[PDB]
Amino acid sequence: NTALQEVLKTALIHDGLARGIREAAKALDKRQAHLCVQASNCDEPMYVKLVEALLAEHQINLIKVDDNKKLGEWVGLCKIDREGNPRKVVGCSCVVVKDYGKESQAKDVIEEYFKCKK
RNA sequence: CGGACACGGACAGGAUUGACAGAUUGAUAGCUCUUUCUCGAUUCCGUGGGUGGUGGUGCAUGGCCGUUCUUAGUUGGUGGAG
Ligand SMILES: [Zn+2]
């Protein structure tokens, strides 16, 4: 009840991510890839094939979420506002985490990993 | 572009930077073009609004300066005259 809800919220304050329409499928090619995330609403079955094309033979893990729009307020483009429109982003399908920096509640995302995926 | 901001759009399933090579230039200006790699919300676009100007107007002015003006000249108060 803690992995899907809140311990991926706290890995998002000022950490490394992908941003915009030119680097979502970019970060996979580097040897700094910690926990990444992919949306299970992707219109083509080739992009989701392409993110598992690297990580399934390597040390990198994706978590399948609903869509990328609900990840749009997770990347950093905050559009939910008091005098602002709560609908401005069409969010990202693949962001990574380069470095955590803080270790308050960062265990519970990797606790999900080696519990079934070993 | 060194067009700030403000709003809408464009906008992670494809906004924007940079650049080797060649006909391409006056020019090793990616200026543009053919082709392709690269940059990470930075911008780009429309609409308002700034802003810059050795642009106008010295007869819209300030300041400074020249001059009549290198000569002795000028002004109140209170009384006097009208
Ligand atoms: Zn003029």
Side-chain angles (χ1 to χ4, degrees), chain A residues 1-86 89-118:
Chain A
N1 53 2
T2 312
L4 193 146
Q5 285 294 107
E6 64 181 359
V7 304
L8 81 161
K9 304 283 191 182
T10 188
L12 297 174
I13 292 94
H14 66 87
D15 298 331
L17 284 91
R19 193 166 308 280
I21 63 165
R22 296 282 192 182
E23 57 176 355
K26 198 76 173 178
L28 78 162
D29 295 323
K30 273 75 65 174
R31 297 291 183 185
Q32 294 86 23
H34 286 175
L35 189 271
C36 64
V37 55
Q38 202 272 333
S40 63
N41 208 165
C42 183
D43 187 73
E44 65 273 20
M46 282 75 77
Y47 177 80
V48 64
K49 187 184 292 181
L50 194 57
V51 59
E52 64 93 21
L54 188 274
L55 59 88
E57 286 88 7
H58 286 93
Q59 296 85 17
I60 302 98
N61 44 355
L62 61 86
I63 296 167
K64 292 186 285 185
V65 300
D66 285 334
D67 55 354
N68 43 359
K69 279 80 173 172
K70 183 254 290 178
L71 201 144
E73 65 272 20
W74 289 352
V75 56
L77 290 182
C78 181
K79 78 279 192 186
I80 181 69
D81 196 356
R82 300 295 92 208
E83 291 87 2
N85 46 355
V89 300
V90 176
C92 186
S93 292
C94 176
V95 291
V96 303
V97 173
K98 297 188 290 182
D99 193 2
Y100 290 102
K102 79 279 284 180
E103 195 66 28
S104 179
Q105 200 175 7
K107 301 293 183 181
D108 195 78
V109 293
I110 200 66
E111 185 69 30
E112 178 67 32
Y113 177 66
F114 61 91
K115 186 174 181 293
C116 178
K117 297 181 181 182
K118 302 291 106 174

